[PDB]
Design a protein around this nucleic acid. Structure first.
Lengths: 81, 83, 89
RNA sequence: AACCAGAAAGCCACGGCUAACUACGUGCCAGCAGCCGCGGUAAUACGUAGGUGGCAAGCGUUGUCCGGAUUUAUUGGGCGUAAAGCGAGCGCAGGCGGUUUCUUAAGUCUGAUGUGAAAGCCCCCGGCUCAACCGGGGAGGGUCAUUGGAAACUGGGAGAC
RNA sequence: UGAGAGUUUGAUCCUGGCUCAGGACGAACGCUGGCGGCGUGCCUAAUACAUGCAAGUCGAACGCUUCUUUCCUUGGAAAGAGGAGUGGCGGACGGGUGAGUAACACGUGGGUAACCUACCCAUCAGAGGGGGAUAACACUUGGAAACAGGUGCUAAUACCGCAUAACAGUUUAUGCCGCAUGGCAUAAGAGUGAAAGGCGCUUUCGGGUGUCGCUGAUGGAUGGACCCGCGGUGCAUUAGCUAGUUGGUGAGGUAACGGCUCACCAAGGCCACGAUGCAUAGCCGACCUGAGAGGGUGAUCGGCCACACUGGGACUGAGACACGGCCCAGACUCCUACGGGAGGCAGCAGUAGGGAAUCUUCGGCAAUGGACGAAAGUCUGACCGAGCAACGCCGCGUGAGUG
């Protein structure tokens, strides 16, 4: 039988769509950053700094809950030099 | 220190592994039905820093936190060593 | 979400309640934290026997009495003394 | 609140253990029995008769658990003949150990503190017109846990005869 | 606080078995069967389940369709009327069952200088403002249907950037517990945040306020998670077991420590104090019994763990790897115009089947207890009660003095 839980199926499916979209945006941002740091070509700092700041913009909007975002910025700060 | 741990004494059997000794505490119980003083032993595994103690030393250890794949105490003090 | 409330302990037709503080997840007669006073349903007026160092020091911790328990413990003016005396600060 | 003891009592055994009977037709057949054992003109073991004999809507039977069982004996058993000392020796591990000084205090006892949910079995007191229900107290739930002391005895270390 | 009788013999003392007298039951089976006060009722097949009820509610973030009213009689302010949602909270509580499990599952005693936590009291700055895109509905497409597509509208506490918080975390500086690692207070170095918001009062200016929110982050309360000492089972006609196994280094990952997972290096670890293997079993408060030491049991009531036809896997969500939610595989069963579809009685009554054997396909939220809701109300086989059964305890009976 189904009574009113079929509301929650549609709700959770839409939440799947937007949550997976935003987190894949975050992961490709971090991938772009890590490929940028290992390059070491011209513009090694300025596009790096724009990438750092865009990554942090994406991170604090994001969700783990609150904790391992700080771990990400700790392991991200040590990846400068 | 607003709450104490539990510290145990004992001696060392074997420490062939790096940064790791083996501590045996030892006491005597009673049989539950009969009455004589049976003795028995355990083998802990305590963490050491830089190869302090050796085979036969009476050493003491403290309850720490889960430190490895079950080696869980920290060495305190080489007390009485012989050769 | 602690909530001080009743606990039915009757025989078959004659109940007997005890005012008790329990989490809302727990069942009607399951566990609790402590038994704070009691009340016969029968024999008006039935006594609210208390130490009353628990209610004053327990709603101040943050708790919410239900319908019957508040509307009988208002007969000692318990929290009105307290949030009157939050001006002590 | 008007009238009645009327509407209104039950069930298995009697050879010993087993308190709880006597007598009549039945005849090693038909039967009974927890153990011992009863049956061929006696069954005081089938039916009848009054009795007798038992708890208080019960009474017998089957099955399962503890006692009596000191018949796994630590408290609390034994091995000449009744069940029961290996055919005999050498010895690893283990168990147990002469006297004494000092010393540690693992085992030892003890003070204080924390907990051993609620309801149960207890005891006291109330109500439920007496069973059942609730209330407050206490041993009750540790071989517990932390903190402080003794070195008489056994472990441990240094020595001595 | 500890009671002994019968039976080995022509008769005797020992030793030794067998049996009886005492209790208890979720009992059953025969005989008996008056009333009431309390209880209890699939222990077998965690076997297959027709039939009917077990969980919804919401205006004060919100907007749009459907009734009657004096609605400037053509539409009409205004009151109650509202299908699905940008839309919240609940459905992880409450009820069942003991199939698994010989281990940190439980019981006690402790730890967290390795942890997370939807309401309330607040706590340092607060409590930024501005902006922009979409369902239902209407028309159409395939099929009787479960239902699946296009074109057009709108609502915000969804979406967007943007400076405004470093007290995140790091360095440095300045004072102590240590348990080494480290952590606990004050100021600076580099990076970053959002709900820009509701019903009402006054409405002189054209905004002051009562009931409502979100953080840069803190505290209490509550619930959850990890980890250790000790304890509770039979077999030696079961003696060796282990290769992410044991340690180190580095990285990843998690609410955090950690072979939890990877890459490299060294060969370690457990065992007569019974490992590994086979078999049985959920654990505890407790209950029966006994002088006591003990022995047996874990059904009523309370606490914990584990399971949802069998086996996997994730998502939403603070919280599940989710009783009823989703997806996939397996066994079974049902409906149809045959093209396609649908489901899990270990919820309450009830059905076949097994069995020596265990109830009614009832009433109602009056009461206690939840969930939603400014508040009336709404849901409830939780629960409160009426059935049935000598199944257990009882309070008793069928007068007292008599003839």
């Amino acid at each position: 039988n189904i009574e009113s839980a079929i509301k929650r199926v549609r709700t959770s499916a839409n939440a799947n769509a937007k949550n997976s979209s935003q987190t894949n945006a975050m992961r490709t941002a971090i991938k772009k950053f890590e490929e940028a740091v290992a390059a070491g070509a011209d513009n090694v700092d300025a596009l790096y700094n724009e990438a750092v700041k865009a990554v942090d913009m994406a991170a604090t909007k994001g969700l783990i809950h609150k904790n391992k975002a700080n771990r990400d910025k700790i392991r991200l700060s040590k990846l400068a030099k | 220190e607003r709450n104490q741990r539990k510290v145990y004494q004992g001696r060392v059997v074997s420490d062939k592994m790096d940064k790791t000794i083996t501590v045996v505490v030892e006491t005597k119980k009673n049989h539950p039905i009969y009455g004589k003083r049976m003795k028995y032993s355990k083998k802990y595994k305590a963490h050491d820093e830089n190869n302090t103690a050796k085979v036969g030393d009476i050493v003491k250890i403290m309850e720490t936190r889960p430190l490895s794949a079950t080696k869980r105490f920290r060495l305190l003090e080489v007390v009485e060593e012989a050769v | 979400a602690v909530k001080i409330r009743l606990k039915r302990m009757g025989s078959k037709k004659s109940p007997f309640y005890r005012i008790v503080v329990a989490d809302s997840r727990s069942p009607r007669d399951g566990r609790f934290i402590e038994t704070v006073g009691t009340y016969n349903p029968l024999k008006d007026p039935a006594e609210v026997v208390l130490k009353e160092d628990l209610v004053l020091d327990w709603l101040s911790k943050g708790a919410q009495p239900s319908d019957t328990v508040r509307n009988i413990l208002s007969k000692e003016g318990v929290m009105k003394k307290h949030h009157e005396a939050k001006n002590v600060k």
